[PDB]
């Protein structure tokens, strides 16, 4: 049980360090800057 | 080259588009009257599509 307590604490440490990695590696923007984005439909209307 | 039959067909289709509830007076059947309004309708569709794009 005494070792299991530290196992729980280390697992808590591992999960709270797991939860920080995915926030810094989010591909929100998905050369994309050179091309006209289809989501940016204002540029599409401008071209049309 | 759109013939005068297709020209007048597009004019007839454009008459109910423009007037709608407004009455449609009769035109003299000659190539001049059919020819002039064709360019007006052709550019009116273009500018209305463009203004649709601007509004959206």
UniProtKB/Swiss-Prot annotation, chain A:
It comes from the Eukaryota. It is found in: Cytoplasm, Cytoskeleton, Microtubule organizing center, Centrosome; Cytoplasm, Cytoskeleton, Spindle. Residues 1-24 form a coiled coil. Component of the HAUS augmin-like complex. The complex interacts with the gamma-tubulin ring complex and this interaction is required for spindle assembly. Interacts with EML3 (phosphorylated at 'Thr-881'). Belongs to the HAUS3 family. Contributes to mitotic spindle assembly, maintenance of centrosome integrity and completion of cytokinesis as part of the HAUS augmin-like complex. This is HAUS augmin-like complex subunit 3. It comes from Homo sapiens (Human). The lineage of its organism: Eukaryota, Metazoa, Chordata, Craniata, Vertebrata. The gene is HAUS3.
From Swiss-Prot, chain B:
It is found in: Cytoplasm; Cytoplasm, Cytoskeleton, Microtubule organizing center, Centrosome; Cytoplasm, Cytoskeleton, Spindle; Cytoplasm, Cytoskeleton, Spindle pole. Contributes to mitotic spindle assembly, maintenance of centrosome integrity and completion of cytokinesis as part of the HAUS augmin-like complex. HAUS1-depleted cells retain functional cell cycle checkpoints, but the depletion decreases the G2/M cell cycle compartment and induces apoptosis. The protein level remains constant through the cell cycle. The chain holds residues 1 to 56 of 278 of the full protein. Widely expressed. Expressed in pancreas, kidney, skeletal muscle, liver and heart. Weakly expressed in lung, brain and placenta. Belongs to the HAUS1 family. It comes from the Eukaryota. This is HAUS augmin-like complex subunit 1. Component of the HAUS augmin-like complex. The complex interacts with the gamma-tubulin ring complex and this interaction is required for spindle assembly. Associates with microtubules. The interaction with microtubules is strong during mitosis, while it is weak or absent during interphase. It is unclear whether this interaction is direct or indirect. Interacts with EML3 (phosphorylated at 'Thr-881'). It comes from Homo sapiens (Human).
């Amino acid at each position: 049980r005494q070792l299991e307590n530290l196992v729980q604490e280390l697992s808590q440490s591992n999960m709270m360090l797991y939860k920080q990695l995915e926030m810094l590696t989010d591909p929100s923007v998905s050369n994309p800057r050179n091309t006209i984005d289809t989501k940016d439909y204002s540029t599409h209307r401008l071209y049309q | 080259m759109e013939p005068q039959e297709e020209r007048e067909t597009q004019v007839a289709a454009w008459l109910k588009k423009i007037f709608g509830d407004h009455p449609i007076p009769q035109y003299e059947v000659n190539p001049r009257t059919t020819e002039i309004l064709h360019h007006l309708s052709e550019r009116n569709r273009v500018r209305d599509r463009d203004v649709y794009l601007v509004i959206e």
